[PDB]
Amino acid sequence: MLDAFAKVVAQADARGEFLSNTQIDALSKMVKEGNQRLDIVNKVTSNASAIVTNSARALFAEQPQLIQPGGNAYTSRRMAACLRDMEIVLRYVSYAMIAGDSSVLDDRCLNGLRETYQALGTPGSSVAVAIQKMKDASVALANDTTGTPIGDCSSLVAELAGYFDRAAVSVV
Amino acid sequence: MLDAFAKVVAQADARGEFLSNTQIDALSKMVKEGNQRLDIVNKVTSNASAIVTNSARALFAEQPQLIQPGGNAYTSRRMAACLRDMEIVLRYVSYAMIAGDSSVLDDRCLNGLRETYQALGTPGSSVAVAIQKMKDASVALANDTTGTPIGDCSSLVAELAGYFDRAAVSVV
Amino acid sequence: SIVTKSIVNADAEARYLSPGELDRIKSFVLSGQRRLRIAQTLTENRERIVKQGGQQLFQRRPDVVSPGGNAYGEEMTATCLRDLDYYLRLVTYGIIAGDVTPIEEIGLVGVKEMYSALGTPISGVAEGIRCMKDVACSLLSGEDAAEVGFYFDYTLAAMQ
Amino acid sequence: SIVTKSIVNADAEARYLSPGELDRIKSFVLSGQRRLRIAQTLTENRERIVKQGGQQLFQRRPDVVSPGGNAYGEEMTATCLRDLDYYLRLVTYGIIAGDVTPIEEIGLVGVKEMYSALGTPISGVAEGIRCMKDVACSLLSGEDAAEVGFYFDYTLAAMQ
Amino acid sequence: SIVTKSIVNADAEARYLSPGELDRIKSFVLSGQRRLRIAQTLTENRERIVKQGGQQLFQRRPDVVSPGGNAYGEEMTATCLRDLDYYLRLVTYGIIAGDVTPIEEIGLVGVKEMYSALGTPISGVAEGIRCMKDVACSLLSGEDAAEVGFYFDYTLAAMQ
Amino acid sequence: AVKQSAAAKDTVETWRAAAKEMAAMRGISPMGEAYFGGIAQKVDNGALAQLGNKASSYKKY
Amino acid sequence: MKTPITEAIATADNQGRFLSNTELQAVNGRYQRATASLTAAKALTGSAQRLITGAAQAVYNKFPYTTQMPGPAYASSAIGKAKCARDIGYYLRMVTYCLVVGGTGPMDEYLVAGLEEINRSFDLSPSWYIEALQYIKNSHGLSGQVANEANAYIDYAINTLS
Amino acid sequence: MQDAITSVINAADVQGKYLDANSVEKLRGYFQTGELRVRAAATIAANAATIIKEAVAKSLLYSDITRPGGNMYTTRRYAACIRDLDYYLRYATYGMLAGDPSILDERVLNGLKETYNSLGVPIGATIQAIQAMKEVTGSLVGSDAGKEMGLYFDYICSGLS
Amino acid sequence: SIPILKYSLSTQNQRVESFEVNPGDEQYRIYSTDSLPSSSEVDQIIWAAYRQIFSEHQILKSTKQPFLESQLRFNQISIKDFIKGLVLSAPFRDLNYNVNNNYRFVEICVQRVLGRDIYNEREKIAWSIIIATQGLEGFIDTLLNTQEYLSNFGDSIVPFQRRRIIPQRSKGEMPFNLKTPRYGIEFRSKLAATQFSWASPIRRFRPQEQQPKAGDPALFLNMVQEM
Amino acid sequence: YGFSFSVLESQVKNGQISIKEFVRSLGKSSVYQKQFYQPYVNSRVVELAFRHFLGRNLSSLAEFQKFFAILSKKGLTGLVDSLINSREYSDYFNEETV
Ligand SMILES: C=CC1=C(C)[C@@H](Cc2[nH]c(/C=C3N=C(/C=C4\NC(=O)[C@H](C)[C@H]4CC)C(C)=C\3CCC(=O)O)c(CCC(=O)O)c2C)NC1=O
Ligand SMILES: C=CC1=C(C)[C@@H](Cc2[nH]c(/C=C3N=C(/C=C4\NC(=O)[C@H](C)[C@H]4CC)C(C)=C\3CCC(=O)O)c(CCC(=O)O)c2C)NC1=O
Ligand SMILES: CCC1=C(C)/C(=C/C2=NC(=C\c3[nH]c(/C=C4\NC(=O)[C@H](C)[C@H]4CC)c(C)c3CCC(=O)O)/C(CCC(=O)O)=C2C)NC1=O
Ligand SMILES: CCC1=C(C)/C(=C/C2=NC(=C\c3[nH]c(/C=C4\NC(=O)[C@H](C)[C@H]4CC)c(C)c3CCC(=O)O)/C(CCC(=O)O)=C2C)NC1=O
Ligand SMILES: CCC1=C(C)/C(=C/C2=NC(=C\c3[nH]c(/C=C4\NC(=O)[C@H](C)[C@H]4CC)c(C)c3CCC(=O)O)/C(CCC(=O)O)=C2C)NC1=O
Ligand SMILES: CCC1=C(C)/C(=C/C2=NC(=C\c3[nH]c(/C=C4\NC(=O)[C@H](C)[C@H]4CC)c(C)c3CCC(=O)O)/C(CCC(=O)O)=C2C)NC1=O
Ligand SMILES: CCC1=C(C)/C(=C/C2=NC(=C\c3[nH]c(/C=C4\NC(=O)[C@H](C)[C@H]4CC)c(C)c3CCC(=O)O)/C(CCC(=O)O)=C2C)NC1=O
Ligand SMILES: CCC1=C(C)/C(=C/C2=NC(=C\c3[nH]c(/C=C4\NC(=O)[C@H](C)[C@H]4CC)c(C)c3CCC(=O)O)/C(CCC(=O)O)=C2C)NC1=O
Ligand SMILES: CCC1=C(C)/C(=C/C2=NC(=C\c3[nH]c(/C=C4\NC(=O)[C@H](C)[C@H]4CC)c(C)c3CCC(=O)O)/C(CCC(=O)O)=C2C)NC1=O
Ligand SMILES: CCC1=C(C)/C(=C/C2=NC(=C\c3[nH]c(/C=C4\NC(=O)[C@H](C)[C@H]4CC)c(C)c3CCC(=O)O)/C(CCC(=O)O)=C2C)NC1=O
Ligand SMILES: CCC1=C(C)/C(=C/C2=NC(=C\c3[nH]c(/C=C4\NC(=O)[C@H](C)[C@H]4CC)c(C)c3CCC(=O)O)/C(CCC(=O)O)=C2C)NC1=O
Incomplete structure (x- = not known):
């Protein structure tokens, strides 16, 4: 597991030189944005169980055959497993937002998630539909200017949007 | 594990359809042959160790190269394993005769069994004739009328035959 | 197109084009402004026309997507929608060419040999194009829906 | 039969029948005793060959019998087995004629037009004949099962 | 390959192949088992050999990736690594062909005209292949690194 | 021809004893089931279409 | 699914023993009470559309807010009332699946396991479904031991929700 | 258009001599495999x-x-392909029965590679289709029969190359 | 009386040592009952036992074991008797034992219980006769009395996947819940008539002429974004 | 290619028209002229007509100019009718033999 600072340390550890004085200015620009980072995470971790169930409900109206009798997410054993499966993806996306780099997203979550949907028979294209349902709810809640000073945060919600559509192309 | 009743239900819940009136009667057909279904199994477990040792001796009246030095079933660990596997196969087909379909037979025993023996080096078709030495030691033992009165029950012993040759082609 | 087969018709007959042929090449090119608008509607609606096209196709033919169906799994279902994107594209060609000549020699000539040789139910793919037709004609007015639907049902006719 | 098309072959060529044609009419009529025994086995096994034929057909294609399938209900399922009784009958003709000429002009020529025009999945009826083939060849020895199965798979080939 | 130009050499001279030519076609085909192992190492190491190849290339030539460099931005840098994937592929061909004949008529003949006409510094792409060579020879033993590196430096020579 | 009427002229009659006991499996009481892997594919549940008949089945008289 | 047959099979390969006469009597008592069970599953399937639409109306008469509150969890829409009626279709279908196999196997597999996690995620009150099941329990019209078998799997569905 | 018997008779006739022991020796070799070829076909x-x-x-x-x-x-x-592949699997069946590939170049090979170049048909993909078709044909007819049917597939692939 | 089939070992990460004194970040969190937890910290052990022996799915209300949970909190049974109650739990039979055979169930009970991968495929053959002779309750206590269970878990540690990652690296191996799911491809494909008949919904429509061909620079844009 | 002339197979299988009628109507069809008339020259169309409607090549030079001028003036419908209505067709094939 790395954070954003660890990928600059461990890169030049393989090159073996000291960290340059123009690379410190890139790390100090990150800690100036370090407190706008912490309320993108606090906005999405607090409405976490309503990002999930409002995105599942939007999925099951577009593709109604996933919940009809003989469908994949039909029973009450497997509706709960489908609802869990978006909670785990939203968990590791917010983990990779607070670290700054995606090295824990594709390690404990996406490392072979595609190959276990071929074994389970789960439609992997429909999990990537319901991740982009959750991307549209989470970047709208990271623009919420209540209890926070007004400023430009467009470069950090575009990084949160990057970890959502990385986990969508890794299941199809 | 599904019995004969659960295989009707699992096919009807997958389509989301109730049970019809003429499908209730075919399961009510099964329970008036209920004593005849049960006392077949009261033969084949009560003479069960006789069926093993009669067939295992008579296999080497047919293929004595297994007990040859260098052969597969030569040694006393391996002779104890050949009577082991014929005791297990006789055990699961008694479970399917009390069920009514072979779903406990090909989920426990026969699933992935050819690839065991080819990785073991055991001759595949040469254990299938040991199963067919147990069927005629049991379907003749089922037609014996000790203690029970007389009625036409050739339909049930065909299914008792029908498990022994479903199991015979799964090891070849 | 109407221009190329009105020529090859009069070509074979050793003659020039009659007023009946030249008052329609004339009538077709003045129709050309309205044709590009119609094809422009279907061009950037392929996301909905195809995806909702395969919507009704699976609800009407669950066999083809069920286990054992030809388009079963994540793989075949993607190709299951790929063909609909093909046939939706050829209808855009037929609308601009003013004829099913583009649809004729692409996706229609010998189509039963392909789908029979692929194991695909040819009646099933015909059901898919009909589902796309209701989505397409729902995107246009009545004067246009008599055209865009008009090319689909020709594809329905030749596909069975 | 082999007798009628070995004639119409040599008929068209303005010639008589060669030894290659007359040593096979000869070889076929001495085969005639064994053919009637084979057809006699399938004749009064139609109760099991058809009913077990539709056994595996529904287990392999539950769509056709499910609600919405072509053979849904008490009515269509009876006709669902009626066609299998037809094709099982034509195989008895082909075995005695020594050729699929009876099966050719009955149940094969233009069969796709009928079943496409009836809404029946032609691939589904092909699955039905294959299920009958395993029941039929299970009723005969190896020397016979290379024939009785041999006529079914021709019907499978022409039915797709 | 060594087989095709040992032929076209003796072809032009109106003669057959000498022992010097036929004891090397012989010596090359017995070498063929060891060549496929070497090319098999570079085949599924292109992820590291290319990505670490462009690693040292940018650290040694930051001008080409800096603003104003030819490979500037997300776009050109992707194509910046695409060419290295090309030349790494041709080296796998040269190892199996036992000669730079595949590398000769692909990626070497007239290469200066292309890169001069694309605005790319041809010396810069030569630096890229050298960085790939140190990664490639680090993946193999000394007996192999005298070959895999041997084809890179030929590409270095012709690329300047 | 009148001696052969109504029994031997009906080729679908001989399988009516089996095709309406083969087709008495998984009946559906409300509207909606036979979901078939998760699609709609519903029911008609009337007296006619529970026997699978159509408008071309009483009009054949 | 847990039937009386498949639990008699299950204790055999617990020990890895053969099927003795400590399991043939378990299948024997199942065949006694299956003649008062399939006469109950026939009558619940035959009057299924009467029971389902009568049980949707018993919820709406007791809880009239559900027919008029806005929001997705309530049956105040057209599609809210259809999702309510198929839920009571699902609760009646698992009762007649449990009467056929003679045990609580199908509703353990399909209804019960995971039920709390979807009634909490979709804001469905479990007192709605007890009122939908209490209408069925004393208005199926059965009489006797055929009634006594339907009032043990409806009552098993209630005690999960209660 | 000669079979194995026609080719044996031609070579024995072209020298004006009778069918000696060597000519009949190959003919007996063809009659031995006569049972295998029919079941293969x-x-x-x-x-x-x-x-x-x-x-x-x-x-x-x-x-x-x-x-x-x-x-x-x-x-x-696409439909021309399976029509086209049908001839290769069909004419190869004729060569397998006749035991002589004379029918292939007589009716398939001549003007074939010169025709695909006209249409622009890729000869590379064509041979691999026939190679894959040869691979499945060895599945059905067995090993030695696949060796026989396979012996005429690559004859088509060689000349078509 | 028939000893086990003498299989062979292989090369793995758990049978060497790490030289990791003061291990930094990827430690897999030894929950234990010798650290004397509080009643809110017994609850963080019981969730780790449910996540290890089941997956993260089957921690439902019906799959909890509320009488086995209370005997852990009274210190009546150990962790080793608590893992044995979870494999013999009736949710673990009908969800993870009825849907695969004996040669895949050994791959579950060595990946989750022992925390290591299987050595080779003969070990699945060598272990699967224990389940068919004396049962699943005879299979777990001969798997919990091995030296690989006692020498790094003992009587007080909930097990874990030992040495999943290499300490200078960041990729490592696959987690075992994402390695072996509830059922495999061989149980799913054989039941496509009764169960598992789903047919797949429609993918997002990508047009065919926008797909990259050999020699396109759009096949290297994922390489350039990793620079 | 799944082509179909159901009307012509109708009128020939019943005997309403000859094979020669069925062959001539096939020649004036549009699936023919799209196949063997459009992609070629009137020069090459004349020789490809003889291979089809006569089963032989052109014989002389004057046999070309007689049949090129006909195709030159009446196209496909004038050429194929001038081959089917010749004597050489009738001597080999009259009304029944393909
Ligand atoms: C542990 C809890 C914890 C938090 C929740 C944050 C909360 C937080 N954010 C800011 C400070 C800020 N917070 C924002 C954030 C936003 N403005 C917007 O318009 C967006 C809606 C939103 C984030 C997406 C900005 C833009 C600033 C800096 C003000 C500026 O530079 O203009 C500050 C003041 C810091 C300072 O004065 O230096 C604090 C305490 N930090 C924490 O430690
Ligand atoms: C513990 C297990 C167990 C049993 C096996 C049965 C034993 C049993 N079988 C029968 C009764 C019967 N049992 C049989 C069975 C047979 N008769 C034959 O000739 C064949 C050898 C054999 C079937 C293959 C038949 C046919 C009857 C009915 C008697 C009749 O036909 O009149 C009866 C009398 C009442 C009844 O019908 O149930 C009993 C107690 N009951 C049990 O509790
Ligand atoms: C380590 C982190 C982690 C990942 C990445 C993970 C994936 C994962 N998803 C699973 C199941 C599942 N996933 C789904 C999800 C869906 N099916 C659908 O129809 C929808 C399209 C979609 C979501 C809405 C379902 C229904 C199952 C249950 C499989 C079953 O019981 O049949 C399973 C099997 C049981 C489970 O643990 O949930 C794994 C292992 N599990 C993990 O523990
Ligand atoms: C799911 C139920 C189940 C089955 C069916 C099963 C089979 C099974 N049979 C085995 C071995 C064996 N099986 C045989 C049996 C035979 N070899 C012969 O030559 C004869 C044909 C035949 C005896 C009549 C022998 C000799 C071995 C020992 C192989 C060895 O130890 O090297 C082994 C290897 C472990 C061992 O017993 O040593 C397995 C896993 N295991 C199961 O759990
Ligand atoms: C422009 C005219 C045109 C068409 C139409 C066309 C079709 C076409 N469909 C294909 C496959 C396929 N097509 C389907 C289609 C379906 N499955 C179903 O259940 C449905 C009924 C149906 C779609 C609505 C499937 C499943 C495959 C893959 C078959 C296999 O993998 O064996 C393939 C082979 C793979 C490929 O190259 O794409 C071609 C060439 N090509 C063309 O040039
Ligand atoms: C001797 C050659 C021959 C055949 C084969 C034949 C078929 C034939 N099948 C028919 C109907 C039918 N055939 C089916 C068949 C099926 N449904 C399915 O799901 C299955 C896939 C399939 C059977 C295995 C159905 C459902 C009908 C009734 C269709 C309707 O009522 O609209 C009918 C119309 C009713 C009748 O007159 O019987 C004919 C003529 N006729 C012939 O002369
Ligand atoms: C197999 C032999 C072979 C080669 C080598 C080859 C090269 C090649 N390089 C190209 C572009 C390019 N190549 C570069 C390359 C570089 N920029 C730098 O700073 C570096 C010095 C250097 C790479 C290490 C750039 C930036 C472009 C895009 C130029 C532009 O967009 O104007 C293009 C045009 C786009 C394309 O079709 O890919 C071709 C054809 N083609 C071939 O067939
Ligand atoms: C077979 C086992 C099984 C059960 C128990 C089950 C319950 C279930 N009920 C649901 C919804 C629902 N259930 C209701 C039901 C009601 N609301 C009311 O106002 C009425 C009082 C009441 C009952 C008549 C409504 C309105 C929804 C939609 C809520 C939403 O989508 O947010 C959903 C969400 C998905 C959907 O169907 O749209 C599930 C999974 N599903 C199953 O597969
Ligand atoms: C009996 C000996 C014999 C052969 C073999 C033969 C081939 C032949 N192949 C043709 C076309 C064709 N052949 C193909 C074949 C292919 N496309 C591919 O990508 C594959 C590599 C290949 C399939 C294996 C295609 C696509 C055409 C149509 C070309 C066009 O329309 O331009 C044509 C043009 C006319 C027509 O098909 O009606 C002839 C005459 N003729 C003969 O008399
Ligand atoms: C069954 C008995 C057994 C074997 C056979 C075994 C092999 C083994 N060698 C390993 C690593 C290794 N092996 C080497 C050795 C070398 N690399 C070099 O560059 C040198 C050329 C060479 C030695 C001079 C290195 C450096 C690592 C660690 C890789 C790393 O952590 O970066 C690892 C990875 C785990 C670890 O860090 O220890 C295993 C499992 N381990 C065992 O327990
Ligand atoms: C364009 C004007 C036109 C018509 C109408 C026409 C009819 C026509 N109908 C025919 C046969 C036929 N027509 C039928 C029709 C029917 N059987 C019934 O029971 C129904 C009452 C009826 C369907 C409505 C049948 C069964 C044959 C085949 C007769 C046979 O094989 O003996 C034939 C014999 C050749 C063939 O079909 O290939 C012709 C020529 N030809 C024409 O040029």
């Missing part, structure tokens, strides 16, 4: 459509000749 007739469906799906089904721009894109062009 039997199953190939049965699974003609299945073999061609297996070859195209195994060799060139998803390659970009199948996609737009590829040599097999339009339905007329």
